[PDB]
Design an enzyme around this catalytic site. Sequence first.
Site, PDB file in Angstrom:
ATOM      1  N   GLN A  40       3.634   1.688   2.870  1.00 35.44           N
ATOM      2  CA  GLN A  40       3.287   0.720   3.907  1.00 35.44           C
ATOM      3  C   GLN A  40       3.678  -0.704   3.471  1.00 35.44           C
ATOM      4  OE1 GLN A  40      -0.605   1.207   5.573  1.00 35.44           O
ATOM      5  NE2 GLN A  40      -0.823  -0.975   6.118  1.00 35.44           N
ATOM      6  N   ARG A  93       0.882  -1.174   0.000  1.00 36.01           N
ATOM      7  CA  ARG A  93       0.000   0.000   0.000  1.00 36.01           C
ATOM      8  C   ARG A  93       0.914   1.216   0.000  1.00 36.01           C
ATOM      9  NH1 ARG A  93      -2.915   2.907   5.056  1.00 36.01           N
ATOM     10  NH2 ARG A  93      -4.409   4.181   3.893  1.00 36.01           N
ATOM     11  N   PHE A 122       4.704   1.792   8.296  1.00 39.17           N
ATOM     12  CA  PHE A 122       4.777   2.708   7.185  1.00 39.17           C
ATOM     13  C   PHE A 122       5.895   3.716   7.413  1.00 39.17           C
ATOM     14  CE2 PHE A 122       2.345   6.381   9.029  1.00 39.17           C
ATOM     15  CZ  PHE A 122       1.695   5.761  10.073  1.00 39.17           C
ATOM     16  N   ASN A 127      -2.119   0.103  11.719  1.00 40.94           N
ATOM     17  CA  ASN A 127      -3.004  -0.614  12.622  1.00 40.94           C
ATOM     18  C   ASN A 127      -4.414  -0.619  12.044  1.00 40.94           C
ATOM     19  OD1 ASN A 127      -4.546   1.646  13.658  1.00 40.94           O
ATOM     20  ND2 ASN A 127      -2.725   2.238  14.845  1.00 40.94           N
ATOM     21  N   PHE A 174       1.950  10.741   0.785  1.00 44.46           N
ATOM     22  CA  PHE A 174       1.440  10.277   2.065  1.00 44.46           C
ATOM     23  C   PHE A 174       2.464   9.341   2.733  1.00 44.46           C
ATOM     24  CE2 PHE A 174      -2.203   7.592   4.142  1.00 44.46           C
ATOM     25  CZ  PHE A 174      -1.826   8.004   5.404  1.00 44.46           C
ATOM     26  N   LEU A 181      -2.198  11.599  12.330  1.00 42.87           N
ATOM     27  CA  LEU A 181      -1.973  10.268  12.863  1.00 42.87           C
ATOM     28  C   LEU A 181      -1.401  10.303  14.283  1.00 42.87           C
ATOM     29  CD1 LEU A 181      -0.679   8.537   9.638  1.00 42.87           C
ATOM     30  CD2 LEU A 181      -3.038   8.652  10.495  1.00 42.87           C
ATOM     31  N   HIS A 194      -1.315   6.311  15.756  1.00 38.83           N
ATOM     32  CA  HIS A 194      -0.302   5.348  15.337  1.00 38.83           C
ATOM     33  C   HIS A 194       0.957   5.591  16.159  1.00 38.83           C
ATOM     34  CE1 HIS A 194      -2.514   3.920  11.789  1.00 38.83           C
ATOM     35  NE2 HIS A 194      -3.145   5.066  11.972  1.00 38.83           N
TER      36      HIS A 194
END
Length: 164
Positions: free
Chosen positions: A62, A54, A112, A101, A59, A121, A125
């Site tokens: 991951q 991903r 990530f 998560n 951004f 985040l 996270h």
Amino acid sequence: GNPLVYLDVDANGKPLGRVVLELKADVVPKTAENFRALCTGEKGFGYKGSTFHRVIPSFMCQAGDFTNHNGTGGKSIYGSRFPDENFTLKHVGPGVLSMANAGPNTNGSQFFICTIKTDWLDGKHVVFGHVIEGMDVVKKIESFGSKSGRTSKKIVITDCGQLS
């Protein structure tokens, strides 16, 4: 001091180079130890041979689902999932290393690397390290992502381990 670990990454079977990560074991020892041991493979499983599944430009990138290769799997060295250790480190900019998560207290093995500040985040996270070397490799990975997260090249952690 804090562990230094590495990921050697290919795209479509050709090497991009090495990402070196410092793990902030002083701040998040349990989270750092999980990642460290998954890099060495010393528990009999870990990141070697798994993928960045991903990847979203502007951004993050991951990885870490070494069981299902799609964002549903992974496991920690402690068991399937483990708690959020703390939220002390923040998502301050490109190069932050943080746990993916599925809500509170669902850390496993997915992680990530941010390519921007991802402040929203914070508190959600667990940040546990940062890129020491190899942001160029991260930018290459990022460039093979898409808005949906689907990658346009097969991005594989061919080798990984601990440097110190």
